[PDB]
Amino acid sequence: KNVSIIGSPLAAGQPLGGVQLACDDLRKLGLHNVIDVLGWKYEDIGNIDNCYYDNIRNIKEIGIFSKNLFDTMSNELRKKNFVLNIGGDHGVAFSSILSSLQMYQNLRVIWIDAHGDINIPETSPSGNYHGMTLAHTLGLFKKKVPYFEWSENLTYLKPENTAIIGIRDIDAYEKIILKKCNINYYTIFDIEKNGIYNTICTALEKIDPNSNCPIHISLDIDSVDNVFAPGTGTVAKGGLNYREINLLMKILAETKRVVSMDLVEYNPSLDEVDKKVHGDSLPILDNATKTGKLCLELIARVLGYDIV
Amino acid sequence: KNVSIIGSPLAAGQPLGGVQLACDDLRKLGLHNVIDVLGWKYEDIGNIDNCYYDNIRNIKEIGIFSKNLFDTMSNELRKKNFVLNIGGDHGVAFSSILSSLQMYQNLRVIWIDAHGDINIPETSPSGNYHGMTLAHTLGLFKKKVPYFEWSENLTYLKPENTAIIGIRDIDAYEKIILKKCNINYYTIFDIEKNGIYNTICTALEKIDPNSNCPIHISLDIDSVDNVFAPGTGTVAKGGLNYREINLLMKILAETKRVVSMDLVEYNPSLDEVDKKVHGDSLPILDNATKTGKLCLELIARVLGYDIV
Amino acid sequence: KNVSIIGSPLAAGQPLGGVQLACDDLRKLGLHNVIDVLGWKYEDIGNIDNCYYDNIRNIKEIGIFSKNLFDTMSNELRKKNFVLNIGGDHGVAFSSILSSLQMYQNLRVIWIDAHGDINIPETSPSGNYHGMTLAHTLGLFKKKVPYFEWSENLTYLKPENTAIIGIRDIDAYEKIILKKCNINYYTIFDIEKNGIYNTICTALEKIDPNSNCPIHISLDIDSVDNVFAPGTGTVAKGGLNYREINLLMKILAETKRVVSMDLVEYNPSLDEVDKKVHGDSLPILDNATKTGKLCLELIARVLGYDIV
Ligand SMILES: N[C@@H](CCCC[B-](O)(O)O)C(=O)O
Ligand SMILES: N[C@@H](CCCC[B-](O)(O)O)C(=O)O
Ligand SMILES: N[C@@H](CCCC[B-](O)(O)O)C(=O)O
Ligand SMILES: [Mn+2]
Ligand SMILES: [Mn+2]
Ligand SMILES: [Mn+2]
Ligand SMILES: [Mn+2]
Ligand SMILES: [Mn+2]
Ligand SMILES: [Mn+2]
């Protein structure tokens, strides 16, 4: 029950700023107090500081930041702590997942997102890296990436060892990549048909039939519906509801196999207040904005927070 | 993959105006662009122009309009195009369904609505025709209808060949008609018990056990909850949510047997904005009002639009 | 089909006033008209007027009020009427349930609430009695309660004969009491996993395997999500939705075994308006605040109000 906290305030994978503020906001809202009350101990590492594709925006900053995160996270993973990586946009999952993967070669990844993040630079509508991070992590890139030379000899994640859950906003070319690479995916319609519980059980059975693999959770908060998670940059209608995302995190916690996690795309500047109701009983700041509070509650779920 | 578009701006089946504006609003919002991007071809026909019961409001206008729609739609159906009939209030479904039925004698009808629309003139609380249209189509009327003489020798729809889905606001007498005529109905409580997916599968198995019949979808947008579809004249609490109505249309599209469809009761004047989020990726006008946008997205589902 | 209506305007189990106004507000909104239209007859009794633990707030007022309610309700129960007890905060369920229990010794209780109300005075964070009422009713109190001497020789409710449904906001010590006393409980996560229908069926099978026991429903309106029930003092995120709470009440009505019911924690002063939509068709005041209207609709469900 030791968690290393790593702030990864990278905001270069997409146009906007705001997400760079996520890590410190969550600390302000009571991250340490929440971890404490759940009976975990933490080590807060602070914040990460900061032939070829030529069409990836801000790639220099991203590559240099990612090397730093890769190195820092590798060191925390070696302590056999649970490692919590707080973004930042989703670009931070490349180094997060690959560092975890080098240590846990049988790692299984649950990517929770409204989006596929599985564009390659030649299919991307935007040139924004956060929309390509999963493709990059999966080894789907066809050319070298400037400032990622340090990463070229790493082992990459395999599609069959991954499940994407909650998706509903996929680009035209992206749809083809999704089917082609054989990744396991569960759309919001699958969730509507079968319920979130059956969906995650199905996903886990698919990628870890023997229930014996370490799990990395990469949670993009925009997987959650706008009603509950307004504080994020790229919204898509029809998301996971409050009950669903909480149940999903609880089920993943109960595997007892989660070794690392990203929580990405929280943008405090975009967030709103309810606010404070009696049920906000974790040691979270009164009247905290609702997405920040949800982030902390979802982190609590992964650390074993339960209704009874 | 050819669709005929028929605008049916009838607003006489109920008190309000607004719905007469629906057809052109949907065109403005990007109807043609949406059909194009899905790889369908369209022919836009434009807009329909315009012993006895004595207690039906505006019946002259309704009867005369319905003859015109019957004739116009009959002609489009003969091309073996998919025919999309955009209302207008629900009164336009009488001619829509009966013209389709004369051509497709084994037609099965899925009536998606918060209401039964199955009052007869002697049970109607309002005298508004849009609340009687299904009863009329089913041959449940007991007297002749002024200005409907042209329709008296048509074959009428049978209750056992129909399923009403999503209902929750039914008048006292209407409840008796519903049980008496033996129509298949699936209330919002059935949907809550079994989920939208099991419900539509059950309905389809009930009315088309051999999966071999052409299908007409009559979609009243007020079937959808107020939260997602404010732009409609007669609201009822506890409607289909965004995920449910999208899944329902997708499942119906996947039968590959849908030959015609009404989309009725959209009232642009009553509609509101979110607005524009990243997930609004169909070629729909940026910041379009949310019900209009939903209408277009639901039309896209029927034409095969899917998440991946 | 005779219902006795008892107004129990007790507000001393918690800090706030507002709930004392609930009973008369529901009458103003059309309680009698609703009962009438459902074909029930009512007798409106009006409103109840008004070694040891030393840490229970307002206990004198609560104990004295509870004796009065116990006596009044005992008398109504003897008529073999369905007895509807309208709070007031949840403190009124002690006398309600115990009076019903003395008459119906095989009573089964369905406690519908976001909270456990199962603190004992030595674990209570607040000293507010409404958060202890279920523990008190279950005989879990360890010391005598001032002004409850009249109750000391009553038979208390047993945990195995009780099901709590909808819970999501439970205090730390309370979680231990919940597991220890062996009460049957179904959290919002159980509801999310299995659906409200499977949950209530499971609960009923658990506590009444032979489907032969009288049922008391203790409905705290804060079980319902904030979106639908803002007019209540202690809100918790992720509650039952409009479709769920309506279905739950319908299923309980259909047992045909409900003999008594509390509807508690409605605070008109906290309530808001939609307002009036076509679907508000029960004889409820036009534009009534939404929680009050929901209360009446849920009472209608218990008296057999159904979609068709
Ligand atoms: N598919 C879009 C949207 C990406 C959204 C990124 B994410 O999931 O981290 O918010 C793009 O490639 O630009
Ligand atoms: N049952 C009511 C309401 C009808 C609603 C019509 B509809 O479904 O087209 O909105 C009436 O007969 O007036
Ligand atoms: N557990 C809290 C909250 C109680 C809420 C009471 B109720 O369910 O009637 O709203 C307390 O003991 O103070
Ligand atoms: Mn993402
Ligand atoms: Mn995303
Ligand atoms: Mn209709
Ligand atoms: Mn309708
Ligand atoms: Mn309560
Ligand atoms: Mn409560």
PDB file of N, CA and C in Angstrom, chain B residues 119-167:
ATOM      1  N   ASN B 119     -55.616   7.424 -29.426  1.00  0.00           N
ATOM      2  CA  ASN B 119     -56.981   7.884 -29.181  1.00  0.00           C
ATOM      3  C   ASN B 119     -57.830   7.793 -30.442  1.00  0.00           C
ATOM      4  N   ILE B 120     -59.115   7.510 -30.272  1.00  0.00           N
ATOM      5  CA  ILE B 120     -60.075   7.722 -31.345  1.00  0.00           C
ATOM      6  C   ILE B 120     -60.798   9.039 -31.063  1.00  0.00           C
ATOM      7  N   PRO B 121     -61.475   9.613 -32.068  1.00  0.00           N
ATOM      8  CA  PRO B 121     -62.033  10.946 -31.807  1.00  0.00           C
ATOM      9  C   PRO B 121     -62.984  10.988 -30.613  1.00  0.00           C
ATOM     10  N   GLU B 122     -63.658   9.884 -30.304  1.00  0.00           N
ATOM     11  CA  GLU B 122     -64.576   9.882 -29.171  1.00  0.00           C
ATOM     12  C   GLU B 122     -63.910   9.688 -27.796  1.00  0.00           C
ATOM     13  N   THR B 123     -62.607   9.399 -27.774  1.00  0.00           N
ATOM     14  CA  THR B 123     -61.875   9.297 -26.507  1.00  0.00           C
ATOM     15  C   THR B 123     -60.849  10.422 -26.323  1.00  0.00           C
ATOM     16  N   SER B 124     -60.565  11.163 -27.391  1.00  0.00           N
ATOM     17  CA  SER B 124     -59.534  12.200 -27.355  1.00  0.00           C
ATOM     18  C   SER B 124     -59.870  13.309 -26.361  1.00  0.00           C
ATOM     19  N   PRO B 125     -58.917  13.639 -25.475  1.00  0.00           N
ATOM     20  CA  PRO B 125     -59.072  14.740 -24.515  1.00  0.00           C
ATOM     21  C   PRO B 125     -58.899  16.094 -25.187  1.00  0.00           C
ATOM     22  N   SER B 126     -58.277  16.096 -26.361  1.00  0.00           N
ATOM     23  CA  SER B 126     -57.808  17.329 -26.972  1.00  0.00           C
ATOM     24  C   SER B 126     -58.459  17.641 -28.320  1.00  0.00           C
ATOM     25  N   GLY B 127     -58.877  16.608 -29.044  1.00  0.00           N
ATOM     26  CA  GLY B 127     -59.380  16.800 -30.393  1.00  0.00           C
ATOM     27  C   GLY B 127     -58.255  17.032 -31.386  1.00  0.00           C
ATOM     28  N   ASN B 128     -57.015  16.921 -30.909  1.00  0.00           N
ATOM     29  CA  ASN B 128     -55.835  17.059 -31.759  1.00  0.00           C
ATOM     30  C   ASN B 128     -55.526  15.748 -32.464  1.00  0.00           C
ATOM     31  N   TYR B 129     -55.458  15.815 -33.785  1.00  0.00           N
ATOM     32  CA  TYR B 129     -55.308  14.630 -34.617  1.00  0.00           C
ATOM     33  C   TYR B 129     -53.995  13.870 -34.383  1.00  0.00           C
ATOM     34  N   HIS B 130     -52.902  14.582 -34.110  1.00  0.00           N
ATOM     35  CA  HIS B 130     -51.610  13.906 -33.925  1.00  0.00           C
ATOM     36  C   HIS B 130     -51.653  12.906 -32.763  1.00  0.00           C
ATOM     37  N   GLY B 131     -52.623  13.073 -31.868  1.00  0.00           N
ATOM     38  CA  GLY B 131     -52.816  12.134 -30.778  1.00  0.00           C
ATOM     39  C   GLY B 131     -53.729  10.970 -31.149  1.00  0.00           C
ATOM     40  N   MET B 132     -54.149  10.907 -32.415  1.00  0.00           N
ATOM     41  CA  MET B 132     -55.041   9.830 -32.880  1.00  0.00           C
ATOM     42  C   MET B 132     -54.481   9.078 -34.091  1.00  0.00           C
ATOM     43  N   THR B 133     -53.375   9.572 -34.642  1.00  0.00           N
ATOM     44  CA  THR B 133     -52.874   9.096 -35.927  1.00  0.00           C
ATOM     45  C   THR B 133     -52.638   7.587 -36.001  1.00  0.00           C
ATOM     46  N   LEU B 134     -52.113   6.996 -34.932  1.00  0.00           N
ATOM     47  CA  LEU B 134     -51.867   5.565 -34.944  1.00  0.00           C
ATOM     48  C   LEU B 134     -53.187   4.785 -34.958  1.00  0.00           C
ATOM     49  N   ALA B 135     -54.163   5.230 -34.167  1.00  0.00           N
ATOM     50  CA  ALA B 135     -55.481   4.592 -34.159  1.00  0.00           C
ATOM     51  C   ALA B 135     -56.105   4.650 -35.547  1.00  0.00           C
ATOM     52  N   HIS B 136     -55.954   5.790 -36.205  1.00  0.00           N
ATOM     53  CA  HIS B 136     -56.491   5.993 -37.541  1.00  0.00           C
ATOM     54  C   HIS B 136     -55.840   5.042 -38.542  1.00  0.00           C
ATOM     55  N   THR B 137     -54.516   4.976 -38.492  1.00  0.00           N
ATOM     56  CA  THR B 137     -53.722   4.105 -39.350  1.00  0.00           C
ATOM     57  C   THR B 137     -54.063   2.632 -39.122  1.00  0.00           C
ATOM     58  N   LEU B 138     -54.435   2.294 -37.892  1.00  0.00           N
ATOM     59  CA  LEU B 138     -54.731   0.907 -37.536  1.00  0.00           C
ATOM     60  C   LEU B 138     -56.174   0.516 -37.873  1.00  0.00           C
ATOM     61  N   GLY B 139     -56.942   1.447 -38.431  1.00  0.00           N
ATOM     62  CA  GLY B 139     -58.336   1.197 -38.759  1.00  0.00           C
ATOM     63  C   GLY B 139     -59.274   1.173 -37.562  1.00  0.00           C
ATOM     64  N   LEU B 140     -58.941   1.911 -36.505  1.00  0.00           N
ATOM     65  CA  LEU B 140     -59.727   1.838 -35.276  1.00  0.00           C
ATOM     66  C   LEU B 140     -60.832   2.887 -35.250  1.00  0.00           C
ATOM     67  N   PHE B 141     -60.783   3.838 -36.182  1.00  0.00           N
ATOM     68  CA  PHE B 141     -61.834   4.845 -36.269  1.00  0.00           C
ATOM     69  C   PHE B 141     -63.180   4.174 -36.584  1.00  0.00           C
ATOM     70  N   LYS B 142     -64.250   4.684 -35.983  1.00  0.00           N
ATOM     71  CA  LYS B 142     -65.575   4.077 -36.099  1.00  0.00           C
ATOM     72  C   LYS B 142     -66.471   4.791 -37.113  1.00  0.00           C
ATOM     73  N   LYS B 143     -66.180   6.062 -37.375  1.00  0.00           N
ATOM     74  CA  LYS B 143     -66.933   6.840 -38.348  1.00  0.00           C
ATOM     75  C   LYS B 143     -66.018   7.282 -39.478  1.00  0.00           C
ATOM     76  N   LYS B 144     -66.605   7.889 -40.505  1.00  0.00           N
ATOM     77  CA  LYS B 144     -65.839   8.443 -41.614  1.00  0.00           C
ATOM     78  C   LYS B 144     -65.154   9.727 -41.185  1.00  0.00           C
ATOM     79  N   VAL B 145     -64.058  10.053 -41.852  1.00  0.00           N
ATOM     80  CA  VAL B 145     -63.330  11.266 -41.532  1.00  0.00           C
ATOM     81  C   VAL B 145     -63.446  12.251 -42.677  1.00  0.00           C
ATOM     82  N   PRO B 146     -63.938  13.457 -42.384  1.00  0.00           N
ATOM     83  CA  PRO B 146     -64.025  14.476 -43.435  1.00  0.00           C
ATOM     84  C   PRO B 146     -62.696  14.644 -44.174  1.00  0.00           C
ATOM     85  N   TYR B 147     -62.765  14.698 -45.501  1.00  0.00           N
ATOM     86  CA  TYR B 147     -61.596  14.943 -46.347  1.00  0.00           C
ATOM     87  C   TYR B 147     -60.590  13.792 -46.391  1.00  0.00           C
ATOM     88  N   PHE B 148     -61.017  12.614 -45.941  1.00  0.00           N
ATOM     89  CA  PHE B 148     -60.208  11.398 -46.038  1.00  0.00           C
ATOM     90  C   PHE B 148     -60.861  10.332 -46.934  1.00  0.00           C
ATOM     91  N   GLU B 149     -61.880  10.734 -47.695  1.00  0.00           N
ATOM     92  CA  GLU B 149     -62.591   9.818 -48.587  1.00  0.00           C
ATOM     93  C   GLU B 149     -61.634   9.083 -49.524  1.00  0.00           C
ATOM     94  N   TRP B 150     -60.603   9.783 -49.986  1.00  0.00           N
ATOM     95  CA  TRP B 150     -59.589   9.200 -50.860  1.00  0.00           C
ATOM     96  C   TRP B 150     -58.890   7.986 -50.238  1.00  0.00           C
ATOM     97  N   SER B 151     -59.033   7.819 -48.923  1.00  0.00           N
ATOM     98  CA  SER B 151     -58.280   6.801 -48.187  1.00  0.00           C
ATOM     99  C   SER B 151     -59.120   5.592 -47.803  1.00  0.00           C
ATOM    100  N   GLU B 152     -60.422   5.660 -48.063  1.00  0.00           N
ATOM    101  CA  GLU B 152     -61.352   4.675 -47.513  1.00  0.00           C
ATOM    102  C   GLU B 152     -61.204   3.250 -48.060  1.00  0.00           C
ATOM    103  N   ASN B 153     -60.594   3.099 -49.229  1.00  0.00           N
ATOM    104  CA  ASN B 153     -60.408   1.762 -49.779  1.00  0.00           C
ATOM    105  C   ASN B 153     -58.987   1.236 -49.666  1.00  0.00           C
ATOM    106  N   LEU B 154     -58.172   1.890 -48.846  1.00  0.00           N
ATOM    107  CA  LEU B 154     -56.810   1.431 -48.629  1.00  0.00           C
ATOM    108  C   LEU B 154     -56.800   0.274 -47.642  1.00  0.00           C
ATOM    109  N   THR B 155     -55.752  -0.540 -47.686  1.00  0.00           N
ATOM    110  CA  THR B 155     -55.516  -1.517 -46.638  1.00  0.00           C
ATOM    111  C   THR B 155     -54.877  -0.831 -45.424  1.00  0.00           C
ATOM    112  N   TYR B 156     -55.424  -1.105 -44.242  1.00  0.00           N
ATOM    113  CA  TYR B 156     -54.957  -0.485 -43.008  1.00  0.00           C
ATOM    114  C   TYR B 156     -53.929  -1.358 -42.306  1.00  0.00           C
ATOM    115  N   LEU B 157     -53.135  -0.733 -41.446  1.00  0.00           N
ATOM    116  CA  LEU B 157     -52.117  -1.434 -40.680  1.00  0.00           C
ATOM    117  C   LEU B 157     -52.797  -2.288 -39.621  1.00  0.00           C
ATOM    118  N   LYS B 158     -52.217  -3.450 -39.349  1.00  0.00           N
ATOM    119  CA  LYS B 158     -52.704  -4.332 -38.295  1.00  0.00           C
ATOM    120  C   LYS B 158     -51.872  -4.186 -37.023  1.00  0.00           C
ATOM    121  N   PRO B 159     -52.547  -4.173 -35.868  1.00  0.00           N
ATOM    122  CA  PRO B 159     -51.932  -4.051 -34.538  1.00  0.00           C
ATOM    123  C   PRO B 159     -50.835  -5.071 -34.266  1.00  0.00           C
ATOM    124  N   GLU B 160     -51.063  -6.316 -34.659  1.00  0.00           N
ATOM    125  CA  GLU B 160     -50.095  -7.369 -34.399  1.00  0.00           C
ATOM    126  C   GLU B 160     -48.843  -7.184 -35.248  1.00  0.00           C
ATOM    127  N   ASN B 161     -48.928  -6.346 -36.278  1.00  0.00           N
ATOM    128  CA  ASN B 161     -47.752  -6.053 -37.108  1.00  0.00           C
ATOM    129  C   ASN B 161     -47.026  -4.783 -36.697  1.00  0.00           C
ATOM    130  N   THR B 162     -47.372  -4.282 -35.515  1.00  0.00           N
ATOM    131  CA  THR B 162     -46.862  -3.006 -35.018  1.00  0.00           C
ATOM    132  C   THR B 162     -46.275  -3.168 -33.620  1.00  0.00           C
ATOM    133  N   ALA B 163     -45.224  -2.408 -33.335  1.00  0.00           N
ATOM    134  CA  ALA B 163     -44.685  -2.310 -31.988  1.00  0.00           C
ATOM    135  C   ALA B 163     -44.518  -0.824 -31.633  1.00  0.00           C
ATOM    136  N   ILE B 164     -45.062  -0.407 -30.491  1.00  0.00           N
ATOM    137  CA  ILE B 164     -44.877   0.964 -29.995  1.00  0.00           C
ATOM    138  C   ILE B 164     -43.820   0.883 -28.917  1.00  0.00           C
ATOM    139  N   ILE B 165     -42.813   1.741 -28.991  1.00  0.00           N
ATOM    140  CA  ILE B 165     -41.711   1.661 -28.041  1.00  0.00           C
ATOM    141  C   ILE B 165     -41.439   3.012 -27.388  1.00  0.00           C
ATOM    142  N   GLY B 166     -41.324   3.021 -26.059  1.00  0.00           N
ATOM    143  CA  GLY B 166     -40.870   4.195 -25.317  1.00  0.00           C
ATOM    144  C   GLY B 166     -41.968   4.913 -24.567  1.00  0.00           C
ATOM    145  N   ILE B 167     -43.174   4.342 -24.600  1.00  0.00           N
ATOM    146  CA  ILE B 167     -44.351   5.050 -24.114  1.00  0.00           C
ATOM    147  C   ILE B 167     -44.347   5.220 -22.603  1.00  0.00           C
TER     148      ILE B 167
END
